[PDB]
């Protein structure tokens, strides 16, 4: 096996991108 080289992304943790988001909703109490 070839000698180890750490990934350029750092090696800490898998890339975790910030994604778009949507304010959650609660149901109509009267419905």
């Amino acid at each position: 096996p070839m000698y180890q080289v750490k990934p350029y992304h750092g090696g800490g943790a898998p890339l975790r991108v910030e994604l778009p988001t949507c304010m959650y909703r609660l149901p109509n109490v009267h419905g």
């Binding site: 096996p1 070839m2 000698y3 180890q4 080289v5 750490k6 990934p7 350029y8 992304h9 419905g31």
Partner: protein
């Protein structure tokens, strides 16, 4: 009749425009995908109707079926799945509007649906609309259920044929898997020029183009090889590139003029290392994507027999010259004699005797290549390494450390077709320059297959390229084998076609 349909529908849609009914609305607010809808409500019992839940979905109409005067079913498709729309006037916003929309809609139309989850008596999952909106009408008569048409109108192919999408999803998974594999090994993903003053790194007829601002002709790249090695000289020890190459050659089942490859270069590695890495990458790829090491392939298409191709490592290895000797039933010259005219003549004679055709020029490299094609490559069904090519056919490969006249090179073959090419990189600038001079001399004599000499690259080598091994893979061909396609056009979204 299709022509009539188009004339009639076009007029009806223009009329919708004139009447201010907006047949191409700007925005429809899809709430949930069809896939998620199916997943969320498949647990429903026949007859159920969640009147409290209203959702918005969208897709393309593949079927329209009336049942009485107040009920119409639409087959709504998207994302490779389907959902029934069960429209009864009783649940619709209004009866008049129910009438108007149903009269407006046709097979092929893109629609948005607002309604409730439900299930028919027969147990068919459905959405029961409060309102249906036309999002984009189909002006043509949608086809139902040759290959030319599939390739010239890929969008039609994609609409009608579920498997096509799946092939391109698999293609994408292959590429993404490779990036993950190399990134994890500490490779840097790079981009090198697609336009070159001098094309190199392969044997191919190039595309030529005129660049205006530089007032000079340029060639489209046939490979990125020489740039990558210069980057390794630059001290970037591990590099890779997945990108397009261009070869101005013929089109057939396994060749397209533009195609996608992955090349990577690894300092302090040799060809033995690249064999293990190739095995691990390819076997791991097949297993991750298909669920096992064995994949079914129809080399002659579905009309013929199928074979399970076994990617379980380790792969079979054969040595070009030795195996060719066995295959021919005759002793070949010593490998240190492969540069001689005597050997060329011997190969020419063998080709004649065995009825192996080789068009001019009948050079040693080409005659050997034809022989290898005939007697060795055809035996490579499962993944097979063909190794230790003569130097005369491998002008960028490093001489073999123990076999005089050979090189430390391998090719990986699957189902008689080449998917990878790799070698310990030649890093002796004097020997590389000698080989380039021989190429250029052959080129001037009339051998079109000969390489151009690249001075900038040779100069780069003079600064010191570490011992290094490099590797290339034909992505399209890999995709062919993992999608059971025997025509490269199946794994290219828009293949080149004669108009």
């Amino acid at each position: 009749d299709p022509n009539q349909y188009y004339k009639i529908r076009s007029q009806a849609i223009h009329q919708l425009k004139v009447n201010g009914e907006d047949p191409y609305p700007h925005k429809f607010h899809v709430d949930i995908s069809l896939t998620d809808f199916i997943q969320k409500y498949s647990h429903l019992q026949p007859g159920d109707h969640l009147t409290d839940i209203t959702l918005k979905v969208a897709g393309r109409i593949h079927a329209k079926r009336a049942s009485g005067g107040k009920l119409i079913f639409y087959d709504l498709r998207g994302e490779g799945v389907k959902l029934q729309v069960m429209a009864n006037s009783r649940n619709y916003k209004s009866e008049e509007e129910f009438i108007h929309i149903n009269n407006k809609l046709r097979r092929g139309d893109i629609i948005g649906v607002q309604g409730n989850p439900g299930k028919t008596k027969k147990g068919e999952l459905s959405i029961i609309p409060y309102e249906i909106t036309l999002l984009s009408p189909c002006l043509h008569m949608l086809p139902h259920l040759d290959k030319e048409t599939r390739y010239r109108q890929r969008y039609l192919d994609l609409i009608l044929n579920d498997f096509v999408r799946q092939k391109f999803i698999i293609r994408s998974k292959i590429i993404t898997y490779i990036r993950s594999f190399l990134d994890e090994l500490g490779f840097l993903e790079i981009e090198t020029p697609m336009m070159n003053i001098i094309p190199g790194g392969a044997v191919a007829k190039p595309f030529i183009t005129y660049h205006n601002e530089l007032d000079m002709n340029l060639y489209m790249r046939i490979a990125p090889e020489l740039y990558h090695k210069m980057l390794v000289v630059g001290g970037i020890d591990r590099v890779y590139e997945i990108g397009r190459q261009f070869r101005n050659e013929g089109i057939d089942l396994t060749h397209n003029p533009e195609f996608t490859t992955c090349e990577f270069y690894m300092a302090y590695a040799d060809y033995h290392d690249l064999m293990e890495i190739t095995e691990k990458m390819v076997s791991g790829m097949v297993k991750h994507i298909t669920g096992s090491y064995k994949v079914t392939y129809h080399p002659d298409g579905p009309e013929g027999q199928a074979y399970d191709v076994d990617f379980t490592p380790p792969f079979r290895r054969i040595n070009m010259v030795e195996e060719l000797e066995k295959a021919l039933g005759m002793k070949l010259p010593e490998t240190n004699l492969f540069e001689t005219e005597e050997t060329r003549k011997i190969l020419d004679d063998i080709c004649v005797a065995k009825a192996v055709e080789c068009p001019p020029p009948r050079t040693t490299a080409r005659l050997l290549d034809k022989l290898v094609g005939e007697f060795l490559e055809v035996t490579c069904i499962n993944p097979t390494f063909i190794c230790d090519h003569p130097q005369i056919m491998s002008p960028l490969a490093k001489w073999h450390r123990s076999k005089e006249g050979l090189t430390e090179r391998f090719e990986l073959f699957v189902m008689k077709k080449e998917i990878c090419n790799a070698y310990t990189e030649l890093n002796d600038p004097m020997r590389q320059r000698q080989l380039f001079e021989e190429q250029a001399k052959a080129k001037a004599a009339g051998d079109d297959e000969a390489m151009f000499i690249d001075e900038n690259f040779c100069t780069a080598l003079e600064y010191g390229l570490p011992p290094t091994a490099g590797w290339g893979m034909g992505i399209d061909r890999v995709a062919m084998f993992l999608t059971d396609s025997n025509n490269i056009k199946e794994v290219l979204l828009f293949p080149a076609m004669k108009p």
